[PDB]
Amino acid sequence: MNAPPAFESFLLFEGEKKITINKDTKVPNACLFTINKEDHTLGNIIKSQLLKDPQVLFAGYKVPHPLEHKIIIRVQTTPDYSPQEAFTNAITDLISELSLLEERFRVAIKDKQEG
């Protein structure tokens, strides 16, 4: 009876934002990104990409409760670098990776197939 409908993990309600930036106050140059209707799929790749950034002091992600479909991404950079642009870069270049991987997989297929 109480069960959430299963579409609740990916479908945005009416009024809910996808993504939500919050300036953290406890250290300079720190933000908290709150993703709605996301889980460990989307939150882990962003985190791991952020760790590649040399200008990034701290990067992490959490799932506040596995019954509530939301992740938190906390980014802290160097004063010459907003976490806004950290976060932007770690999506941009990660898309560039997956696009290059998709392209490379495709050719590998067509070579396998009679080759």
């Binding site: 009876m1 069960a3 409908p5 579409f7 479908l11």
Partner: protein
């Protein structure tokens, strides 16, 4: 309200295609017992379409 107790189909939003019966209704919303899941949901009354259940020819 008229359609309380009638068979309706949810035609819009996340529950598209779910059949149910109207257990209660307002000027803007209804409560529908879904035929399938063990649950009653509240929905905007404009998301619904009446299906009805009748037989003709009565002879």
């Amino acid at each position: 309200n008229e359609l309380i107790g009638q068979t309706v189909r949810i035609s819009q939003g996340p529950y598209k295609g779910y059949i149910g019966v109207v257990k209660d209704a307002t000027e803007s919303t209804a409560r529908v017992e879904l035929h399938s899941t063990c649950q009653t949901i509240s929905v905007d009354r404009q998301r619904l379409t009446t299906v009805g259940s009748r037989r003709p020819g009565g002879m």
